From Swiss-Prot:
The organism's taxonomic lineage, starting at the top: Eukaryota, Viridiplantae, Streptophyta, Embryophyta, Tracheophyta
SUPFAM superfamilies (UniProt xref): Bet v1-like
GO molecular function terms listed in the Swiss-Prot or TrEMBL record: abscisic acid binding; protein phosphatase inhibitor activity; signaling receptor activity
Assembly behavior: Monomer. Interacts with AP.
Gene: FRAA2
Tissue: Highly expressed in ripe red fruits. Expressed in roots and white fruits. Expressed at low levels in open flowers.
Taxonomic source organism: Fragaria ananassa (Strawberry)
Record-stated family: Belongs to the BetVI family.
InterPro entries according to UniProt: Bet_v_I/MLP (IPR000916), Bet_v_I_allergen (IPR024949), Plant_def-hormone_signal (IPR050279), START-like_dom_sf (IPR023393)
Protein name per its UniProtKB record: Major strawberry allergen Fra a 1-2
Length: 157
């Protein structure tokens, strides 16, 4: 049965510049996300690793997923991870690999460049509705982080 990759690319915009945005939303995600969205996470636990590349994290929602860290680039503001266990995975979708890149905008903020790679087996049936519902949920989480950082200008400086 046919192996393939379905790639979906999207961009979000922030008034926050890449260094502060990467420090708060990516590097302190385990602490910042439950502070801003308490109803979103029940408990996030490290299975293996020290917090860098190769770390295995279990995540429970207020639903259970297992992520593996693939890449962290503290200078170029690039973060990579993989969904290696969850309800989204099946015989059709064997894995989901993500990449987030923070680029500086003309305004002085960020362009958040997100890539989703669905690793597929056999016939490919991917619904626009499901992809778009996940985009809206990601967009909302990013806007809560943005709000919190604008309200707390000394934090993650």
């Amino acid at each position: 049965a046919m192996a393939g990759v379905f790639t979906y690319e999207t961009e979000f915009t922030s008034v926050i510049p890449p260094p502060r945005l990467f420090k708060a939303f990516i590097l302190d995600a385990d602490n910042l996300i439950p502070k801003i969205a308490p109803q979103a996470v029940k408990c996030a636990e490290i299975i293996a690793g020290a917090g860098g590349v190769g770390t295995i994290k279990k995540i429970t929602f207020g639903g259970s997923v297992t992520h593996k860290i693939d890449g962290i680039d503290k200078e170029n503001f690039v973060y990579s991870y993989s969904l290696i266990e969850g309800d989204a995975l099946s015989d059709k979708i064997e894995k989901i690999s993500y990449e987030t890149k923070l680029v500086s905008s003309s305004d002085g903020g960020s362009i958040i460049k997100s890539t989703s790679n669905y690793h597929t087996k056999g016939d490919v049936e991917i619904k626009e509705e499901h992809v778009k519902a996940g985009k809206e949920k990601a967009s909302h989480l990013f806007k809560l982080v943005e709000g919190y950082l604008l309200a707390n200008p000394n934090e993650y400086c």
